[PDB]
Amino acid sequence: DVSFRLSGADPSSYGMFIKDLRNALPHTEKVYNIPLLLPSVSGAGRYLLMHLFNYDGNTITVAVDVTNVYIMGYLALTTSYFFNEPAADLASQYVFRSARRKITLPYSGNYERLQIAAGKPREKIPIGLPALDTAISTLLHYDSTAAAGALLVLIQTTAEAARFKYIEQQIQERAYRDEVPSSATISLENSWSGLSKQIQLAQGNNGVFRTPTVLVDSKGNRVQITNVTSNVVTSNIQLLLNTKNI
Ligand SMILES: *[C@@H]1O[C@H](CO)[C@@H](O)[C@H](O)[C@H]1NC(C)=O
Ligand SMILES: O=c1cc[nH]c(=O)[nH]1
């Protein structure tokens, strides 16, 4: 399991949690020095448990699929909650079985559906460590519209930070003041599967992407990523989604 406490949190302690999260995801090889997530994992070993604690010390446990860093569902006191999607229903066969009741949320976990449920796109939702405190608090008691927004915060400040060093650093900058994600943040989140794929295809193609990936940069300008020498590949991305799952 991995844990993170908001009470006393600072950029250092958040970076320790993101490191723990990355290190809890199994891999058998690296591709261009980046851990390659596994094609498949059977049974309960598929799911990582993240223990998150708000400022007041209340807690949820979040179940994460280790093949793709997707959040499946979470436990809050004696109730489990899962996305309305087949991978999450499968997860509910293995995790949080001792909950008194299981609620299926009235959406799946992709950004498009969550944003519809929340009533707003994530361009307009501030993120940060204070926002993660708020999200944990919201998830403690069911409210499906509030939960969608909380879950957009939670996914960005855990999974997306684990995937991209730039996103981890953006959350660090928001340790004590929330701010809506930079355009580059959104770009990276949206490009993870594409990038993971192109990096794996570049092996066999001299480091060259078969199809270039369009991104927005740290300055807000629209760059084109064509090969493994790019900083996105050498410095930024930390985990690859296996092409077997693309
Ligand atoms: C590869 O990417 C680098 C870094 O972004 C860029 O300067 C260069 O033009 C690209 N090289 C090739 C061979 O496509
Ligand atoms: O796209 C998805 C679907 C489920 N859970 C996630 O974190 N992301």
PDB file of all heavy atoms in Angstrom, residues 62-63 70-74 80-92 103-110 113-114 139 147-148 150-152 154-155:
ATOM      1  N   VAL A  62      -8.138   4.312  -1.711  1.00  0.00           N
ATOM      2  CA  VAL A  62      -8.406   4.317  -3.139  1.00  0.00           C
ATOM      3  C   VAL A  62      -7.750   3.127  -3.816  1.00  0.00           C
ATOM      4  O   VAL A  62      -6.571   2.866  -3.565  1.00  0.00           O
ATOM      5  CB  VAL A  62      -7.869   5.628  -3.756  1.00  0.00           C
ATOM      6  CG1 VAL A  62      -8.232   5.686  -5.245  1.00  0.00           C
ATOM      7  CG2 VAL A  62      -8.456   6.828  -3.009  1.00  0.00           C
ATOM      8  N   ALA A  63      -8.514   2.408  -4.622  1.00  0.00           N
ATOM      9  CA  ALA A  63      -7.999   1.226  -5.383  1.00  0.00           C
ATOM     10  C   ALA A  63      -7.580   1.646  -6.763  1.00  0.00           C
ATOM     11  O   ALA A  63      -8.333   2.306  -7.495  1.00  0.00           O
ATOM     12  CB  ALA A  63      -9.043   0.107  -5.460  1.00  0.00           C
ATOM     13  N   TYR A  70      -5.310   3.548 -13.353  1.00  0.00           N
ATOM     14  CA  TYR A  70      -6.732   3.985 -13.336  1.00  0.00           C
ATOM     15  C   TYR A  70      -7.268   3.754 -11.959  1.00  0.00           C
ATOM     16  O   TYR A  70      -7.074   2.726 -11.316  1.00  0.00           O
ATOM     17  CB  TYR A  70      -7.593   3.208 -14.322  1.00  0.00           C
ATOM     18  CG  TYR A  70      -7.515   3.659 -15.767  1.00  0.00           C
ATOM     19  CD1 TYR A  70      -6.468   4.445 -16.266  1.00  0.00           C
ATOM     20  CD2 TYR A  70      -8.493   3.233 -16.656  1.00  0.00           C
ATOM     21  CE1 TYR A  70      -6.383   4.862 -17.602  1.00  0.00           C
ATOM     22  CE2 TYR A  70      -8.445   3.590 -18.016  1.00  0.00           C
ATOM     23  CZ  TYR A  70      -7.395   4.394 -18.488  1.00  0.00           C
ATOM     24  OH  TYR A  70      -7.384   4.734 -19.823  1.00  0.00           O
ATOM     25  N   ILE A  71      -7.987   4.776 -11.465  1.00  0.00           N
ATOM     26  CA  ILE A  71      -8.701   4.606 -10.200  1.00  0.00           C
ATOM     27  C   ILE A  71      -9.935   3.812 -10.453  1.00  0.00           C
ATOM     28  O   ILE A  71     -10.703   4.156 -11.371  1.00  0.00           O
ATOM     29  CB  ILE A  71      -9.062   5.984  -9.584  1.00  0.00           C
ATOM     30  CG1 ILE A  71      -7.832   6.617  -8.908  1.00  0.00           C
ATOM     31  CG2 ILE A  71     -10.083   5.860  -8.456  1.00  0.00           C
ATOM     32  CD1 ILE A  71      -6.777   7.075  -9.837  1.00  0.00           C
ATOM     33  N   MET A  72     -10.159   2.795  -9.648  1.00  0.00           N
ATOM     34  CA  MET A  72     -11.308   1.870  -9.787  1.00  0.00           C
ATOM     35  C   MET A  72     -12.461   2.288  -8.898  1.00  0.00           C
ATOM     36  O   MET A  72     -13.636   2.183  -9.292  1.00  0.00           O
ATOM     37  CB  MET A  72     -10.953   0.408  -9.452  1.00  0.00           C
ATOM     38  CG  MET A  72      -9.890  -0.259 -10.313  1.00  0.00           C
ATOM     39  SD  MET A  72     -10.420  -0.494 -11.992  1.00  0.00           S
ATOM     40  CE  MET A  72      -9.977   1.010 -12.827  1.00  0.00           C
ATOM     41  N   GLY A  73     -12.116   2.689  -7.678  1.00  0.00           N
ATOM     42  CA  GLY A  73     -13.111   2.968  -6.633  1.00  0.00           C
ATOM     43  C   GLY A  73     -12.414   3.257  -5.356  1.00  0.00           C
ATOM     44  O   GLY A  73     -11.216   3.433  -5.344  1.00  0.00           O
ATOM     45  N   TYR A  74     -13.141   3.408  -4.282  1.00  0.00           N
ATOM     46  CA  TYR A  74     -12.520   3.845  -3.014  1.00  0.00           C
ATOM     47  C   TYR A  74     -13.452   3.359  -1.898  1.00  0.00           C
ATOM     48  O   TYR A  74     -14.633   3.157  -2.100  1.00  0.00           O
ATOM     49  CB  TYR A  74     -12.287   5.369  -2.906  1.00  0.00           C
ATOM     50  CG  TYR A  74     -13.481   6.195  -3.197  1.00  0.00           C
ATOM     51  CD1 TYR A  74     -14.307   6.646  -2.176  1.00  0.00           C
ATOM     52  CD2 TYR A  74     -13.853   6.472  -4.488  1.00  0.00           C
ATOM     53  CE1 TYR A  74     -15.492   7.307  -2.433  1.00  0.00           C
ATOM     54  CE2 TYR A  74     -14.999   7.178  -4.776  1.00  0.00           C
ATOM     55  CZ  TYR A  74     -15.834   7.628  -3.747  1.00  0.00           C
ATOM     56  OH  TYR A  74     -17.006   8.304  -3.995  1.00  0.00           O
ATOM     57  N   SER A  80     -18.151   1.130   0.186  1.00  0.00           N
ATOM     58  CA  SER A  80     -17.303   1.205  -1.042  1.00  0.00           C
ATOM     59  C   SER A  80     -18.032   1.869  -2.165  1.00  0.00           C
ATOM     60  O   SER A  80     -19.255   1.797  -2.243  1.00  0.00           O
ATOM     61  CB  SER A  80     -16.828  -0.174  -1.465  1.00  0.00           C
ATOM     62  OG  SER A  80     -17.911  -1.042  -1.787  1.00  0.00           O
ATOM     63  N   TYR A  81     -17.289   2.493  -3.067  1.00  0.00           N
ATOM     64  CA  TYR A  81     -17.831   3.184  -4.212  1.00  0.00           C
ATOM     65  C   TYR A  81     -16.977   2.766  -5.443  1.00  0.00           C
ATOM     66  O   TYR A  81     -15.713   2.843  -5.370  1.00  0.00           O
ATOM     67  CB  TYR A  81     -17.655   4.706  -3.978  1.00  0.00           C
ATOM     68  CG  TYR A  81     -18.388   5.227  -2.758  1.00  0.00           C
ATOM     69  CD1 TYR A  81     -17.812   5.177  -1.496  1.00  0.00           C
ATOM     70  CD2 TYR A  81     -19.651   5.674  -2.879  1.00  0.00           C
ATOM     71  CE1 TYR A  81     -18.462   5.665  -0.403  1.00  0.00           C
ATOM     72  CE2 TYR A  81     -20.345   6.161  -1.751  1.00  0.00           C
ATOM     73  CZ  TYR A  81     -19.724   6.181  -0.539  1.00  0.00           C
ATOM     74  OH  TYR A  81     -20.457   6.628   0.562  1.00  0.00           O
ATOM     75  N   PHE A  82     -17.593   2.439  -6.576  1.00  0.00           N
ATOM     76  CA  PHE A  82     -16.847   2.052  -7.807  1.00  0.00           C
ATOM     77  C   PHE A  82     -17.412   2.765  -9.007  1.00  0.00           C
ATOM     78  O   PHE A  82     -18.619   3.031  -9.075  1.00  0.00           O
ATOM     79  CB  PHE A  82     -16.975   0.520  -7.984  1.00  0.00           C
ATOM     80  CG  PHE A  82     -16.222  -0.282  -6.958  1.00  0.00           C
ATOM     81  CD1 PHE A  82     -16.826  -0.700  -5.812  1.00  0.00           C
ATOM     82  CD2 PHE A  82     -14.916  -0.599  -7.160  1.00  0.00           C
ATOM     83  CE1 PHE A  82     -16.159  -1.421  -4.869  1.00  0.00           C
ATOM     84  CE2 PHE A  82     -14.229  -1.356  -6.191  1.00  0.00           C
ATOM     85  CZ  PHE A  82     -14.852  -1.745  -5.054  1.00  0.00           C
ATOM     86  N   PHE A  83     -16.551   3.140  -9.934  1.00  0.00           N
ATOM     87  CA  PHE A  83     -17.032   3.627 -11.216  1.00  0.00           C
ATOM     88  C   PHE A  83     -17.976   2.647 -11.916  1.00  0.00           C
ATOM     89  O   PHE A  83     -17.836   1.442 -11.758  1.00  0.00           O
ATOM     90  CB  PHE A  83     -15.874   3.990 -12.090  1.00  0.00           C
ATOM     91  CG  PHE A  83     -15.160   5.251 -11.676  1.00  0.00           C
ATOM     92  CD1 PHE A  83     -13.817   5.225 -11.319  1.00  0.00           C
ATOM     93  CD2 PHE A  83     -15.842   6.487 -11.676  1.00  0.00           C
ATOM     94  CE1 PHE A  83     -13.159   6.401 -10.957  1.00  0.00           C
ATOM     95  CE2 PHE A  83     -15.208   7.646 -11.237  1.00  0.00           C
ATOM     96  CZ  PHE A  83     -13.849   7.615 -11.003  1.00  0.00           C
ATOM     97  N   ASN A  84     -18.892   3.193 -12.708  1.00  0.00           N
ATOM     98  CA  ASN A  84     -19.841   2.341 -13.451  1.00  0.00           C
ATOM     99  C   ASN A  84     -19.169   1.950 -14.791  1.00  0.00           C
ATOM    100  O   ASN A  84     -19.416   2.576 -15.828  1.00  0.00           O
ATOM    101  CB  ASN A  84     -21.104   3.104 -13.690  1.00  0.00           C
ATOM    102  CG  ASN A  84     -22.230   2.217 -14.231  1.00  0.00           C
ATOM    103  OD1 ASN A  84     -22.222   1.012 -14.075  1.00  0.00           O
ATOM    104  ND2 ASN A  84     -23.183   2.830 -14.851  1.00  0.00           N
ATOM    105  N   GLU A  85     -18.273   0.960 -14.709  1.00  0.00           N
ATOM    106  CA  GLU A  85     -17.491   0.498 -15.876  1.00  0.00           C
ATOM    107  C   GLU A  85     -16.994  -0.914 -15.570  1.00  0.00           C
ATOM    108  O   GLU A  85     -16.784  -1.326 -14.407  1.00  0.00           O
ATOM    109  CB  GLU A  85     -16.385   1.500 -16.280  1.00  0.00           C
ATOM    110  CG  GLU A  85     -15.252   1.498 -15.236  1.00  0.00           C
ATOM    111  CD  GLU A  85     -14.296   2.658 -15.118  1.00  0.00           C
ATOM    112  OE1 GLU A  85     -14.536   3.702 -15.578  1.00  0.00           O
ATOM    113  OE2 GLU A  85     -13.212   2.490 -14.447  1.00  0.00           O
ATOM    114  N   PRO A  86     -16.824  -1.731 -16.643  1.00  0.00           N
ATOM    115  CA  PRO A  86     -16.499  -3.123 -16.346  1.00  0.00           C
ATOM    116  C   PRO A  86     -15.212  -3.412 -15.573  1.00  0.00           C
ATOM    117  O   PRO A  86     -15.227  -4.319 -14.769  1.00  0.00           O
ATOM    118  CB  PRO A  86     -16.536  -3.786 -17.728  1.00  0.00           C
ATOM    119  CG  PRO A  86     -17.374  -2.884 -18.603  1.00  0.00           C
ATOM    120  CD  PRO A  86     -17.266  -1.492 -18.023  1.00  0.00           C
ATOM    121  N   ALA A  87     -14.147  -2.666 -15.799  1.00  0.00           N
ATOM    122  CA  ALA A  87     -12.917  -2.863 -15.087  1.00  0.00           C
ATOM    123  C   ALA A  87     -13.106  -2.591 -13.585  1.00  0.00           C
ATOM    124  O   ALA A  87     -12.461  -3.203 -12.769  1.00  0.00           O
ATOM    125  CB  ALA A  87     -11.853  -1.974 -15.646  1.00  0.00           C
ATOM    126  N   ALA A  88     -13.987  -1.634 -13.242  1.00  0.00           N
ATOM    127  CA  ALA A  88     -14.222  -1.307 -11.833  1.00  0.00           C
ATOM    128  C   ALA A  88     -15.110  -2.318 -11.230  1.00  0.00           C
ATOM    129  O   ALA A  88     -14.940  -2.669 -10.100  1.00  0.00           O
ATOM    130  CB  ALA A  88     -14.822   0.120 -11.672  1.00  0.00           C
ATOM    131  N   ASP A  89     -16.111  -2.844 -11.975  1.00  0.00           N
ATOM    132  CA  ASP A  89     -16.928  -3.884 -11.396  1.00  0.00           C
ATOM    133  C   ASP A  89     -16.064  -5.110 -11.064  1.00  0.00           C
ATOM    134  O   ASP A  89     -16.251  -5.712 -10.028  1.00  0.00           O
ATOM    135  CB  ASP A  89     -18.158  -4.297 -12.247  1.00  0.00           C
ATOM    136  CG  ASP A  89     -18.927  -5.549 -11.588  1.00  0.00           C
ATOM    137  OD1 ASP A  89     -19.554  -5.490 -10.492  1.00  0.00           O
ATOM    138  OD2 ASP A  89     -18.735  -6.644 -12.116  1.00  0.00           O
ATOM    139  N   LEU A  90     -15.158  -5.456 -11.965  1.00  0.00           N
ATOM    140  CA  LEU A  90     -14.192  -6.552 -11.723  1.00  0.00           C
ATOM    141  C   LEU A  90     -13.361  -6.260 -10.495  1.00  0.00           C
ATOM    142  O   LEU A  90     -13.221  -7.109  -9.588  1.00  0.00           O
ATOM    143  CB  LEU A  90     -13.284  -6.767 -12.969  1.00  0.00           C
ATOM    144  CG  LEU A  90     -12.110  -7.787 -12.813  1.00  0.00           C
ATOM    145  CD1 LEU A  90     -12.619  -9.178 -12.525  1.00  0.00           C
ATOM    146  CD2 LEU A  90     -11.182  -7.792 -14.031  1.00  0.00           C
ATOM    147  N   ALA A  91     -12.826  -5.040 -10.399  1.00  0.00           N
ATOM    148  CA  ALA A  91     -12.083  -4.679  -9.188  1.00  0.00           C
ATOM    149  C   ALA A  91     -12.892  -4.970  -7.903  1.00  0.00           C
ATOM    150  O   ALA A  91     -12.359  -5.390  -6.859  1.00  0.00           O
ATOM    151  CB  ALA A  91     -11.668  -3.191  -9.250  1.00  0.00           C
ATOM    152  N   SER A  92     -14.205  -4.689  -7.950  1.00  0.00           N
ATOM    153  CA  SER A  92     -15.058  -4.861  -6.743  1.00  0.00           C
ATOM    154  C   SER A  92     -15.179  -6.317  -6.277  1.00  0.00           C
ATOM    155  O   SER A  92     -15.587  -6.577  -5.145  1.00  0.00           O
ATOM    156  CB  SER A  92     -16.454  -4.268  -6.977  1.00  0.00           C
ATOM    157  OG  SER A  92     -17.315  -5.052  -7.839  1.00  0.00           O
ATOM    158  N   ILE A 103     -21.677   1.025  -3.348  1.00  0.00           N
ATOM    159  CA  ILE A 103     -22.390   1.904  -4.247  1.00  0.00           C
ATOM    160  C   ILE A 103     -21.649   1.958  -5.577  1.00  0.00           C
ATOM    161  O   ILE A 103     -20.412   2.195  -5.617  1.00  0.00           O
ATOM    162  CB  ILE A 103     -22.541   3.337  -3.653  1.00  0.00           C
ATOM    163  CG1 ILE A 103     -23.422   3.254  -2.414  1.00  0.00           C
ATOM    164  CG2 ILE A 103     -23.034   4.318  -4.716  1.00  0.00           C
ATOM    165  CD1 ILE A 103     -23.563   4.498  -1.576  1.00  0.00           C
ATOM    166  N   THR A 104     -22.394   1.796  -6.649  1.00  0.00           N
ATOM    167  CA  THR A 104     -21.862   2.051  -7.978  1.00  0.00           C
ATOM    168  C   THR A 104     -22.130   3.505  -8.297  1.00  0.00           C
ATOM    169  O   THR A 104     -23.278   3.929  -8.391  1.00  0.00           O
ATOM    170  CB  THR A 104     -22.417   1.118  -9.109  1.00  0.00           C
ATOM    171  OG1 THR A 104     -22.197  -0.234  -8.675  1.00  0.00           O
ATOM    172  CG2 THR A 104     -21.677   1.400 -10.398  1.00  0.00           C
ATOM    173  N   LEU A 105     -21.076   4.278  -8.536  1.00  0.00           N
ATOM    174  CA  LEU A 105     -21.254   5.654  -8.960  1.00  0.00           C
ATOM    175  C   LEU A 105     -22.023   5.782 -10.286  1.00  0.00           C
ATOM    176  O   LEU A 105     -21.925   4.880 -11.125  1.00  0.00           O
ATOM    177  CB  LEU A 105     -19.908   6.337  -9.094  1.00  0.00           C
ATOM    178  CG  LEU A 105     -19.086   6.406  -7.816  1.00  0.00           C
ATOM    179  CD1 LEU A 105     -17.657   6.777  -8.103  1.00  0.00           C
ATOM    180  CD2 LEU A 105     -19.724   7.368  -6.782  1.00  0.00           C
ATOM    181  N   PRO A 106     -22.735   6.913 -10.510  1.00  0.00           N
ATOM    182  CA  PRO A 106     -23.565   6.998 -11.725  1.00  0.00           C
ATOM    183  C   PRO A 106     -22.776   7.635 -12.910  1.00  0.00           C
ATOM    184  O   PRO A 106     -23.280   8.497 -13.624  1.00  0.00           O
ATOM    185  CB  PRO A 106     -24.742   7.904 -11.251  1.00  0.00           C
ATOM    186  CG  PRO A 106     -24.113   8.797 -10.240  1.00  0.00           C
ATOM    187  CD  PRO A 106     -23.110   7.954  -9.519  1.00  0.00           C
ATOM    188  N   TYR A 107     -21.508   7.208 -13.054  1.00  0.00           N
ATOM    189  CA  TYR A 107     -20.668   7.520 -14.204  1.00  0.00           C
ATOM    190  C   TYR A 107     -19.453   6.599 -14.194  1.00  0.00           C
ATOM    191  O   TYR A 107     -19.090   6.039 -13.154  1.00  0.00           O
ATOM    192  CB  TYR A 107     -20.214   8.972 -14.148  1.00  0.00           C
ATOM    193  CG  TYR A 107     -19.945   9.491 -12.745  1.00  0.00           C
ATOM    194  CD1 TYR A 107     -18.789   9.193 -12.026  1.00  0.00           C
ATOM    195  CD2 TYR A 107     -20.904  10.281 -12.093  1.00  0.00           C
ATOM    196  CE1 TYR A 107     -18.623   9.653 -10.718  1.00  0.00           C
ATOM    197  CE2 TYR A 107     -20.692  10.786 -10.795  1.00  0.00           C
ATOM    198  CZ  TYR A 107     -19.552  10.467 -10.110  1.00  0.00           C
ATOM    199  OH  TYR A 107     -19.351  10.925  -8.828  1.00  0.00           O
ATOM    200  N   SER A 108     -18.824   6.495 -15.346  1.00  0.00           N
ATOM    201  CA  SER A 108     -17.474   5.918 -15.490  1.00  0.00           C
ATOM    202  C   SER A 108     -16.424   6.945 -15.128  1.00  0.00           C
ATOM    203  O   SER A 108     -16.726   8.106 -14.788  1.00  0.00           O
ATOM    204  CB  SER A 108     -17.271   5.465 -16.935  1.00  0.00           C
ATOM    205  OG  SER A 108     -17.287   6.598 -17.769  1.00  0.00           O
ATOM    206  N   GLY A 109     -15.175   6.499 -15.131  1.00  0.00           N
ATOM    207  CA  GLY A 109     -14.065   7.314 -14.696  1.00  0.00           C
ATOM    208  C   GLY A 109     -13.270   8.076 -15.722  1.00  0.00           C
ATOM    209  O   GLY A 109     -12.265   8.720 -15.413  1.00  0.00           O
ATOM    210  N   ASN A 110     -13.701   8.076 -16.965  1.00  0.00           N
ATOM    211  CA  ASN A 110     -12.970   8.901 -17.878  1.00  0.00           C
ATOM    212  C   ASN A 110     -13.298  10.384 -17.773  1.00  0.00           C
ATOM    213  O   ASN A 110     -14.367  10.820 -17.289  1.00  0.00           O
ATOM    214  CB  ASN A 110     -13.138   8.388 -19.262  1.00  0.00           C
ATOM    215  CG  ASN A 110     -14.533   8.490 -19.702  1.00  0.00           C
ATOM    216  OD1 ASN A 110     -14.999   9.546 -20.174  1.00  0.00           O
ATOM    217  ND2 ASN A 110     -15.240   7.396 -19.542  1.00  0.00           N
ATOM    218  N   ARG A 113     -16.793  11.840 -19.177  1.00  0.00           N
ATOM    219  CA  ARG A 113     -17.951  11.527 -18.310  1.00  0.00           C
ATOM    220  C   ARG A 113     -17.914  12.210 -16.949  1.00  0.00           C
ATOM    221  O   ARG A 113     -18.946  12.578 -16.401  1.00  0.00           O
ATOM    222  CB  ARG A 113     -18.077  10.012 -18.133  1.00  0.00           C
ATOM    223  CG  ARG A 113     -18.629   9.358 -19.383  1.00  0.00           C
ATOM    224  CD  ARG A 113     -20.126   9.671 -19.450  1.00  0.00           C
ATOM    225  NE  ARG A 113     -20.649  10.144 -20.731  1.00  0.00           N
ATOM    226  CZ  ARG A 113     -21.845  10.747 -20.896  1.00  0.00           C
ATOM    227  NH1 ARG A 113     -22.661  11.030 -19.859  1.00  0.00           N
ATOM    228  NH2 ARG A 113     -22.220  11.121 -22.113  1.00  0.00           N
ATOM    229  N   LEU A 114     -16.707  12.292 -16.366  1.00  0.00           N
ATOM    230  CA  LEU A 114     -16.601  12.949 -15.051  1.00  0.00           C
ATOM    231  C   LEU A 114     -16.928  14.418 -15.140  1.00  0.00           C
ATOM    232  O   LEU A 114     -17.563  14.948 -14.218  1.00  0.00           O
ATOM    233  CB  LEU A 114     -15.204  12.791 -14.475  1.00  0.00           C
ATOM    234  CG  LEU A 114     -14.969  11.432 -13.846  1.00  0.00           C
ATOM    235  CD1 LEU A 114     -13.495  11.220 -13.524  1.00  0.00           C
ATOM    236  CD2 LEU A 114     -15.762  11.314 -12.574  1.00  0.00           C
ATOM    237  N   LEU A 139     -15.451  12.933  -0.573  1.00  0.00           N
ATOM    238  CA  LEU A 139     -15.703  11.513  -0.828  1.00  0.00           C
ATOM    239  C   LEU A 139     -16.115  10.739   0.426  1.00  0.00           C
ATOM    240  O   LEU A 139     -16.675   9.650   0.324  1.00  0.00           O
ATOM    241  CB  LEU A 139     -14.508  10.842  -1.516  1.00  0.00           C
ATOM    242  CG  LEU A 139     -14.212  11.537  -2.840  1.00  0.00           C
ATOM    243  CD1 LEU A 139     -12.957  10.918  -3.379  1.00  0.00           C
ATOM    244  CD2 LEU A 139     -15.290  11.352  -3.939  1.00  0.00           C
ATOM    245  N   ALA A 147     -18.849  14.372  -5.772  1.00  0.00           N
ATOM    246  CA  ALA A 147     -17.838  13.339  -5.933  1.00  0.00           C
ATOM    247  C   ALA A 147     -17.152  13.407  -7.325  1.00  0.00           C
ATOM    248  O   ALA A 147     -15.974  13.135  -7.444  1.00  0.00           O
ATOM    249  CB  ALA A 147     -18.393  12.020  -5.678  1.00  0.00           C
ATOM    250  N   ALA A 148     -17.915  13.642  -8.386  1.00  0.00           N
ATOM    251  CA  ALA A 148     -17.271  13.778  -9.731  1.00  0.00           C
ATOM    252  C   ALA A 148     -16.135  14.809  -9.715  1.00  0.00           C
ATOM    253  O   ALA A 148     -15.044  14.561 -10.292  1.00  0.00           O
ATOM    254  CB  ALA A 148     -18.291  14.173 -10.784  1.00  0.00           C
ATOM    255  N   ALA A 150     -14.549  15.955  -7.086  1.00  0.00           N
ATOM    256  CA  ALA A 150     -13.518  15.512  -6.158  1.00  0.00           C
ATOM    257  C   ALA A 150     -12.633  14.499  -6.926  1.00  0.00           C
ATOM    258  O   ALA A 150     -11.423  14.445  -6.749  1.00  0.00           O
ATOM    259  CB  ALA A 150     -14.124  14.906  -4.932  1.00  0.00           C
ATOM    260  N   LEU A 151     -13.257  13.624  -7.699  1.00  0.00           N
ATOM    261  CA  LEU A 151     -12.553  12.567  -8.367  1.00  0.00           C
ATOM    262  C   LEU A 151     -11.677  13.133  -9.491  1.00  0.00           C
ATOM    263  O   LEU A 151     -10.579  12.659  -9.673  1.00  0.00           O
ATOM    264  CB  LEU A 151     -13.484  11.461  -8.880  1.00  0.00           C
ATOM    265  CG  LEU A 151     -14.051  10.632  -7.752  1.00  0.00           C
ATOM    266  CD1 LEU A 151     -15.316   9.920  -8.255  1.00  0.00           C
ATOM    267  CD2 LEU A 151     -13.034   9.609  -7.261  1.00  0.00           C
ATOM    268  N   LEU A 152     -12.080  14.235 -10.137  1.00  0.00           N
ATOM    269  CA  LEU A 152     -11.209  14.890 -11.119  1.00  0.00           C
ATOM    270  C   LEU A 152     -10.000  15.451 -10.424  1.00  0.00           C
ATOM    271  O   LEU A 152      -8.868  15.335 -10.937  1.00  0.00           O
ATOM    272  CB  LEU A 152     -11.988  16.050 -11.840  1.00  0.00           C
ATOM    273  CG  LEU A 152     -12.990  15.532 -12.804  1.00  0.00           C
ATOM    274  CD1 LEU A 152     -13.972  16.641 -13.255  1.00  0.00           C
ATOM    275  CD2 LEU A 152     -12.258  14.948 -14.019  1.00  0.00           C
ATOM    276  N   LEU A 154      -8.733  14.235  -7.502  1.00  0.00           N
ATOM    277  CA  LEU A 154      -7.973  13.094  -6.991  1.00  0.00           C
ATOM    278  C   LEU A 154      -7.130  12.394  -8.079  1.00  0.00           C
ATOM    279  O   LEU A 154      -5.941  12.106  -7.903  1.00  0.00           O
ATOM    280  CB  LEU A 154      -8.941  12.078  -6.400  1.00  0.00           C
ATOM    281  CG  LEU A 154      -8.362  10.694  -6.058  1.00  0.00           C
ATOM    282  CD1 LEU A 154      -7.577  10.884  -4.826  1.00  0.00           C
ATOM    283  CD2 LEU A 154      -9.543   9.703  -5.917  1.00  0.00           C
ATOM    284  N   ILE A 155      -7.771  12.186  -9.237  1.00  0.00           N
ATOM    285  CA  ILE A 155      -7.048  11.516 -10.351  1.00  0.00           C
ATOM    286  C   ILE A 155      -5.839  12.362 -10.785  1.00  0.00           C
ATOM    287  O   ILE A 155      -4.759  11.792 -10.999  1.00  0.00           O
ATOM    288  CB  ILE A 155      -7.995  11.248 -11.536  1.00  0.00           C
ATOM    289  CG1 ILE A 155      -9.007  10.173 -11.144  1.00  0.00           C
ATOM    290  CG2 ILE A 155      -7.195  10.899 -12.831  1.00  0.00           C
ATOM    291  CD1 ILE A 155     -10.167  10.153 -12.139  1.00  0.00           C
TER     292      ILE A 155
END
